[PDB]
Amino acid sequence: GLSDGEWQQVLNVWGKVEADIAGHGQEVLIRLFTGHPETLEKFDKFKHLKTEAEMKASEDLKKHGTVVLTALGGILKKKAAHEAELKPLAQSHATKHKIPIKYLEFISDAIIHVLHSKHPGDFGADAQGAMTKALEDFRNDIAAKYKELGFQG
Template identity: 40%
Template sequence: MCDWDLINKVWAKVEEDLAGNGQTVLLRLFEEHPETKAHFPKFKGIPLGQLTSNADVKTHGNTVFKALGDVVKQKGKHASNLQALATTHINKHKIPPQNFTLITNVILKVFAEKFPGEMTAPAQEAFSKAFKAICSELEDLYKKGGFQS
């Protein structure tokens, strides 16, 4: 069981700059896992150093974090959110399911750095459990959706 109340308490801090925090996570994802950039047509041909000032990265970071916030706020009752997310990422974006694990690992690191007061050991554990559950559910949806990478 995840401590959704604790997660949402931290998430309130994240929402103070949703787009900026999403941008930071995407940039770190591209830095730590350069292969993931290939799944973003707007970004794949742009060197990482130039992406830091790219408005589209911030816009997409906002989109990613808005979707994640919608999941977090459901406090575990997020099946319809994940179904919609899986459907678009399988059929439209063709994003491999393991990329969700990559980005959630990056999120944990970035949050620990940016919000050390909020990302206590219990908060880190709560996010870790929630992200593992979400990624597992997404992998199941991908299998049901017949995803071919």
């Protein structure tokens, strides 16, 4: 995992990518295609380009580079946002409060019960199965942080 400061450095450099996304995206693809020509075969639109100059002249290759970097940027920013909330919680519950994963399962069962008790008409079998999976996914994400911290839990 990244630390808090590492995620902030990822976000800072992506701000620089976005100030010239077309140039960055073009350069990334050319670098991939020249360094690893077998990749270029996946692109039915691009595989006729034989030289770096030909690649640089393609408005379509440039447009696809912008699509890739925009998609990646968005995923990185959403990961960073989730990590900035998950990491402080894992940190405190591993090192200060020393909470086993099993106890997070017990509280997840209590949440599911309270939601079902309070909102039966909004919390049928499908909704309940979805929430059970979301809280298991949450525990799994905390468990991965506990591991990085060496807390067995």
